């Protein structure tokens, strides 16, 4: 029950990492995930869960 596609979630994914305009993860994906997963795994617990 969603006017914006039944799976807007994949829309952002399948479109993100695709090929044409590759949504916009082809690069920015590793850029931010670098910062998110960066300060994340790092300040998450001194490593993974310590």
UniProtKB/Swiss-Prot annotation:
Q: Where are the transmembrane segments?
A: 22-42
Periplasmic face of the membrane: 1-21
Q: Which residues lie on this side of the membrane: Cytoplasmic?
A: 43-50
What does the record say about its membrane topology?
Single-pass type I membrane protein
* Record-annotated disulphide pairs: none
Primary localization class, coarse? virion
Which compartments does it reside in? Virion; Host membrane
| Record carries keyword Cell membrane | no
Task: Give the similarity note.
Answer: Belongs to the inovirus capsid protein family.
| Record's protein name | Capsid protein G8P
First and last residues shown, out of full length: 24 to 73 of 73
